[PDB]
Amino acid sequence: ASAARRKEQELERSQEQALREKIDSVLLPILGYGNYTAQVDIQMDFSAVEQTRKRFDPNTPATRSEYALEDYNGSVRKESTRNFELDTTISHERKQTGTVARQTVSVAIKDRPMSESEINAIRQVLIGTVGFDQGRGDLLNVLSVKFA
Amino acid sequence: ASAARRKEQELERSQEQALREKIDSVLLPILGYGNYTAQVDIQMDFSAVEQTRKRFDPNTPATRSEYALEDYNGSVRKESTRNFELDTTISHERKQTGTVARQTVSVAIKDRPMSESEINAIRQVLIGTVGFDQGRGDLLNVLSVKFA
Amino acid sequence: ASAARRKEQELERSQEQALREKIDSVLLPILGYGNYTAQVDIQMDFSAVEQTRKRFDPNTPATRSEYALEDYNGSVRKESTRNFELDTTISHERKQTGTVARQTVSVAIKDRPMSESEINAIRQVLIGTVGFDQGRGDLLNVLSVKFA
Amino acid sequence: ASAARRKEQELERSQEQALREKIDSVLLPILGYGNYTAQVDIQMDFSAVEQTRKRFDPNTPATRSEYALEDYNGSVRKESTRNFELDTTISHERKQTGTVARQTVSVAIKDRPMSESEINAIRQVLIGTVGFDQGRGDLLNVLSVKFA
Amino acid sequence: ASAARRKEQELERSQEQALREKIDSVLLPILGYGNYTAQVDIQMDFSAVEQTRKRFDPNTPATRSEYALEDYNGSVRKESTRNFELDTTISHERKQTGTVARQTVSVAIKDRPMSESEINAIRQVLIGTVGFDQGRGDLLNVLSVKFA
Amino acid sequence: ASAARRKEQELERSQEQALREKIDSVLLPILGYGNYTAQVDIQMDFSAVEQTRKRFDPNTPATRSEYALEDYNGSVRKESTRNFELDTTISHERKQTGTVARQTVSVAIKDRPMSESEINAIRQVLIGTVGFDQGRGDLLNVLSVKFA
Amino acid sequence: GLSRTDGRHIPA
Amino acid sequence: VDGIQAEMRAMMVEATN
């Protein structure tokens, strides 16, 4: 199984490399060659979830058989027996093993600095270039630093 | 199964490449060569959902057999027994494995900037060029940036 | 099964290509060569729905056997037993796997702009050229843009 | 089964081609060569419906056996038992797989425009040339546009 | 089965061709060569209906055995038991698969226009030339148009 | 079975051809060569009806055994039991498959017009030449038109 | 009564 | 499933009748 773990590491590294390639394909025309640096971290879960759900519909029952005895005298006896049929959904789901659980991307732009408007524009391009998903916990940093 | 995961990555990359090709086929005449850059992120779910639904119709029962005893004297006894037949739908669905769960497209247009009207027109063309589906969570960014 | 998914992608791309061919066959005479650009997105569901419906007719029962005891004295006893026969429809449906769930078409017309009347006329031709179905969620954009 | 889906696409395209051929055979004499353009969209359902209906006739029962006890004293007891025979129809239907569920035809006529009377006459010829069926949801557009 | 669907399309096209041949055989002497154009649409159902009907005759029963007890005292008891024999028809029908469900014919006559009387006379000839059946939903259009 | 449907079409066409031959054999001497045109439409049902009828005679029963107790005292008790024998007809019919369900004939006579008396005489000859059966729904049109 | 219900208990 | 099999049996009853 350790060979499987090794190949999982290979998958994660391949994903990171592909994302880096896309980042380059976007930023190389916009910024130029050597005016930026970017690295990508991709964390992938490899669990084996397998779920079975059996759901009913309480608010729409359908009476199948029914008995109702109601006699008076004073005495009032109200017996009743009822059998129901209910909407039944049975869903069996099997999640894919390797899923990107969190994605971190950081891009540093060489100074000569960059204005806030262009930094936010680059961030907007990257959002969509990488597939930024904040609800997944992903993080995207864009900074303007001084290259040596 | 890790080979299957590798081929799933290949499928996702192929989808992204096809969408990029369509984007180019639309924008190359309109904008020109080298006046734009665009990248596409496609996230695909590969679950194995398999659902079985059994639904009834509570509001239209059909009486199959019926017994009704109603005697008086004062004393009033009202016995009743009833059997019903109901509309029964049984649907077994099996979803396709790989489905595009979210799609992100970002396009950056070289300045010399672009007016808001033409930016929105390009966005309208892309909506339909790519098959934008906001209800799916898809995202489409169109920006006017300064190429270096 | 991933080979099956690949061939599903091929089917979707083939459908898009055919629709593009029809769009060209309509617009090339009307507009000319190079005066327009159009792209088509086709999303196809590949579920495996299989439904069985058993429907009755509550409002037209036919009495098969019947017992009715009605004695008086005062005391009034009204016993009754009844058996019914009902209209029974049993339909087993099996949907076709790959069905176009949503269709998006966008057409951009080169300026020198186009009047609203001719834009709507082109839209009317496309509706029928492509088989526009708004109830399915399809979308058709026709814009007049400035080609570079 | 994907090969079956491919051949279904082939069937749909063949139907569209045949309808286009008929449209040409009608309009080429009337309008001329190159004075019109027309495209046809045909959507075909490929479900596998298979229905079984069991219908009765409540209003014409035939008594098979009958018992009737009616004694007096005052006391009045009216017992009764009755067995019936009913008209029974049992029909098993199996629909053909591929059926044209919706048909869209659009025809554009080159200007030099066309009067409303002749447009409606051409529409009347097409209705019958194509087999227009509004109740099926079919759509037929005839427009007069300016060819370039 | 798709080969069967293909041959069904072939059958429909053959029927249309035969009807067109008959239309020509009637109109070529009457109108001349090239003075008319006509196209025929034939829609054929290919269901597999198979019905079984069991019908009785409620109003002419024949008593097979009979018991009748009628004692008096005052007390009046009228017991009765009766068995019946009824006319029973059992018909099993199996419809032919391919049946013309709707037929559409349109004929356009070259102007130099045609008077209403002769248009109606041509319509009367066609009714019988084609086997017009309005109750089936068939449609027959005869117009006088200007050939180019 | 589609080959069977093809041969059914062949049968219908053969019937139409035979009727046309008879029409010619009657009208060629009377009217001449080229002074008339006639076409015949024959619709044939190919169902597989198979009926079984069991009929009785309620009004002529024959008593087989009989018991009759009639005692007096006042008290009057009239018991009776009776068994009957009835006329029983059991007919099993199997209809021929292909039967002409409707027949349409139209004849057009070249002008130089024809008087009403001779038109009705020709109609009378055709009635009997073709076997006109109005109760079957058949239709026979005879018109006087202007040949070109 | 119809014990048809997979959980029919009323029975009577 | 069971309902479809019942429908098929009903069609077989039709054919036998």
Say which experimental method was used: cryo-EM
A50/chain B closest Cα distance in angstroms:
9
Q: Chain F within 8 Å of E95 (Cβ-Cβ)? A: yes
Q: Cβ contact (<8 Å) for D128 and E86?
A: no
Q: Tell me if C128 sits within 8 A of C20, measured CB to CB.
A: no
CA A43, A45, A47: angle at the middle one, nearest 5? Answer: 170
Q: Distance between CA atoms of H1 and C92, rounded to whole angstroms?
A: 9
Q: Distance between CA atoms of C47 and C100, rounded to whole angstroms?
A: 11
Measure CA of the first residue to CA of the last residue in chain B; give whole Å: 45
CB-nearest to D47 from C25, C85, C94 is C94
Residue A6: alpha-carbon gap to chain centroid: 24
User: What letter represents residue F37's amino acid?
Assistant: T
Q: In which element (H, E) is residue F134 found?
A: none
Neighboring chain C residues of B127 at a CB cutoff of 8 Å: 104, 106, 139, 141
Q: Distance between CA atoms of D86 and C85, rounded to whole angstroms?
A: 9
Q: Distance between CA atoms of E62 and B44, rounded to whole angstroms?
A: 74
- The radius of gyration of chain F's CA atoms, rounded to the nearest angstrom, is 30
What token pair was written down for B117?
């009207």
SS3 state of residue C122: helix
The sheet that has B139-145: what strands, in order across it? B36-45, B99-110, B139-145
What token pair was written down for D25?
């055979």
Q: Distance between CA atoms of D44 and C100, rounded to whole angstroms?
A: 11
Q: Tell me if C130 sits within 8 A of C23, measured CB to CB.
A: yes
Residue of B nearest to G1 (CA): B83
Listed residue (D21, C104, E128) closest to F16, CA to CA:
E128
What token pair was written down for E129?
């030339």
Q: Are chains C and G in contact at 3+ CB pairs closer than 8 Å?
A: no
User: What letter represents residue C111's amino acid?
Assistant: D
Buried b (16+ CB within 10 A) or exposed e, A26-41: bbebbbeeebbebebe
| Dihedral sign, Cα of residue B112, residue B117, residue B121, residue B127 | positive
Q: Tell me if E107 sits within 8 A of E122, measured CB to CB.
A: yes
Interface of B with H in 80-99 (CB under 8 A): 88, 90
Listed residue (E142, E144, E124) closest to E132, CA to CA:
E124
What is the DSSP secondary-structure string of E16-48?
HHHHHHHHHHHHHHHH-TTSEEEEEEEEEE---
Q: Chain E within 8 Å of F47 (Cβ-Cβ)? A: yes
Interface of A with B in 118-137 (CB under 8 A): 118, 121-122, 124-133
SS3 state of residue C131: coil
Q: Tell me if A140 sits within 8 A of A119, measured CB to CB.
A: no
What is the DSSP secondary-structure string of G1-12?
--TTSTT-----
Q: Distance between CA atoms of B143 and C11, rounded to whole angstroms?
A: 33
- Which value, to the nearest 10 degrees, does the dihedral of the CA atoms of residues A27, A31, A34, A36 take? -70
What token pair was written down for C122?
């082109």
Q: Cβ contact (<8 Å) for C47 and B14?
A: no
Residue B7: alpha-carbon gap to chain centroid: 23
CA D40, D43, D44: angle at the middle one, nearest 5? Answer: 130
B7/chain C closest Cα distance in angstroms:
7
Neighboring chain H residues of E51 at a CB cutoff of 8 Å: 14
Q: Cβ contact (<8 Å) for E51 and D91?
A: yes
Q: Cβ contact (<8 Å) for D52 and H17?
A: no
Counting beta carbons within 10 angstroms of the beta carbon of residue D19, is it exposed (0 to 12), middle (13 to 18) or buried (19 or more)?
buried
Indicate the angle between helix axes D2-31 and E2-31, nearest 10 degrees: 10
CA atoms within 13 A on the CB side of B74: 6
CA distances from A12 to A61, A130, B144, F30, F44 (A): 49, 15, 33, 96, 71
Q: Tell me if C138 sits within 8 A of C99, measured CB to CB.
A: no
Q: Distance between CA atoms of B42 and C62, rounded to whole angstroms?
A: 59
Phi and psi at residue E31, to the nearest 5°: -100, -40
β partners of residue F94: F50
Residue of D nearest to C24 (CA): D39
Q: Tell me if D71 sits within 8 A of D107, measured CB to CB.
A: no
Listed residue (C147, B56, F41, C83) closest to A63, CA to CA:
B56
For C1-59, the three-class secondary structure string (H helix, E strand, C coil) is: CHHHHHHHHHHHHHHHHHHHHHHHHHHHHHHCCCCEEEEEEEEEECCCCEEEEEEECCC
Picking from C84, C92, C105, C138 by the largest number of B CB atoms within 10 A of its own CB, the best residue to mutate is: C84
Listed residue (D43, D24, D40, D60) closest to D100, CA to CA:
D43
Residue of D nearest to H16 (CA): D90
Neighboring chain C residues of B22 at a CB cutoff of 8 Å: 39, 41
Question: Running DSSP on this structure, what letter comes out for residue B34?
Answer: T
Phi and psi at residue D64, to the nearest 5°: -90, -55
G12/chain B closest Cα distance in angstroms:
10
Buried b (16+ CB within 10 A) or exposed e, B34-65: ebbbbbbbbbbbbbebbbbbbbbbbeebbbbb
Dmax (CA) of chain C:
102
The sheet that has F50-56: what strands, in order across it? A50-56, A88-94, B50-56, B88-94, C50-56, C88-94, D50-56, D88-94, E50-56, E88-94, F50-56, F88-94
Q: Tell me if A67 sits within 8 A of G1, measured CB to CB.
A: yes
Neighboring chain H residues of D92 at a CB cutoff of 8 Å: 10-11, 14-15
Q: Helices (H), strands (E): how many in chain H?
A: 1, 0
Pair type for strands B36-45 and A139-145: unpaired
What is the DSSP secondary-structure string of B11-30?
HHHHHHHHHHHHHHHHHHHH
Neighboring chain E residues of H11 at a CB cutoff of 8 Å: 50
Which partners does chain G have (≥3 C-beta pairs < 8 Å)?
A, B
| Dihedral sign, Cα of residue F14, residue F15, residue F19, residue F20 | negative
Pair type for strands F50-56 and F88-94: antiparallel
What token pair was written down for E16?
């249309």
What token pair was written down for G7?
């959980």
Residue C43: alpha-carbon gap to chain centroid: 13
What is the DSSP secondary-structure string of B101-130?
EEEEEEEEEE-----HHHHHHHHHHHHHHT
Q: Distance between CA atoms of D117 and D131, rounded to whole angstroms?
A: 21
CA distances from E141 to B144, D127, E14, E106, E127 (A): 58, 8, 21, 5, 11
Q: Cβ contact (<8 Å) for H1 and B88?
A: no
Question: Running DSSP on this structure, what letter comes out for residue A134?
Answer: G
- The radius of gyration of chain A's CA atoms, rounded to the nearest angstrom, is 30
Q: Distance between CA atoms of F141 and E125, rounded to whole angstroms?
A: 7
Dmax (CA) of chain D:
102
Q: Chain B within 8 Å of H1 (Cβ-Cβ)? A: yes
Question: Running DSSP on this structure, what letter comes out for residue D45?
Answer: E
Region of residue C29 (phi > 0: left; psi between -120 and 50: alpha; otherwise: beta): alpha
Q: Distance between CA atoms of D137 and B16, rounded to whole angstroms?
A: 36
Q: Distance between CA atoms of B35 and B15, rounded to whole angstroms?
A: 24
Residue of G nearest to B80 (CA): G1
For residue B111, the tally of other CB atoms under 10 A from its CB is 11
For residue C113, the tally of other CB atoms under 10 A from its CB is 11
Residue of E nearest to F83 (CA): E65
For residue G2, the tally of other CB atoms under 10 A from its CB is 15
A139/chain B closest Cα distance in angstroms:
16
Q: Cβ contact (<8 Å) for C46 and B71?
A: no
Q: Tell me if D47 sits within 8 A of D94, measured CB to CB.
A: no
Q: Distance between CA atoms of A73 and D48, rounded to whole angstroms?
A: 60
Buried b (16+ CB within 10 A) or exposed e, C114-142: beeebbebbebbbbbbbbbbeeeebbbbb
SS3 state of residue A46: coil
The sheet that has E76-85: what strands, in order across it? A76-85, A62-72, B76-85, B62-72, C76-85, C62-72, D76-85, D62-72, E76-85, E62-72, F76-85, F62-72
Neighboring chain C residues of B11 at a CB cutoff of 8 Å: 2, 5-6, 9
Residue E56 neighbours by CB under 8 Å, 6+ apart: D60, D62, D85, D86, D87, E86, E87, E88, E89
Q: Chain H within 8 Å of D59 (Cβ-Cβ)? A: no
Residue H8: alpha-carbon gap to chain centroid: 3
SS3 state of residue A95: coil
- The radius of gyration of chain B's CA atoms, rounded to the nearest angstrom, is 30
What token pair was written down for F58?
């309620």
The sheet that has A99-110: what strands, in order across it? A36-45, A99-110, A139-145
Counting beta carbons within 10 angstroms of the beta carbon of residue D131, is it exposed (0 to 12), middle (13 to 18) or buried (19 or more)?
buried
Phi and psi at residue A7, to the nearest 5°: -70, -30
What token pair was written down for B68?
């009704």
What token pair was written down for C56?
């009755």
Residue D131: alpha-carbon gap to chain centroid: 11
- The radius of gyration of chain H's CA atoms, rounded to the nearest angstrom, is 8
G3/chain A closest Cα distance in angstroms:
8
Which partners does chain D have (≥3 C-beta pairs < 8 Å)?
C, E, H
SS3 state of residue E97: coil
Neighboring chain D residues of E52 at a CB cutoff of 8 Å: 89-91
Q: Distance between CA atoms of B21 and B38, rounded to whole angstroms?
A: 10
| Dihedral sign, Cα of residue B107, residue B113, residue B114, residue B116 | positive
Neighboring chain B residues of G2 at a CB cutoff of 8 Å: 83
What is the DSSP secondary-structure string of F5-23?
HHHHHHHHHHHHHHHHHHH
Buried b (16+ CB within 10 A) or exposed e, C45-64: bbbebbbbbbbbbbeebbbb
Q: Distance between CA atoms of H15 and H17, rounded to whole angstroms?
A: 6
For D94-142, the three-class secondary structure string (H helix, E strand, C coil) is: ECCCCEEEEEEEEEEEECCCCCHHHHHHHHHHHHHHCCCCHHHCCEEEE
Residue A81: alpha-carbon gap to chain centroid: 48
What token pair was written down for B70?
């109603």
CA atoms within 13 A on the CB side of B114: 23
Residue of D nearest to H13 (CA): D90
Picking from D36, D85, D141 by the largest number of C CB atoms within 10 A of its own CB, the best residue to mutate is: D141
SS3 state of residue A90: strand
Pair type for strands D62-72 and E36-45: unpaired
User: What letter represents residue B46's amino acid?
Assistant: F
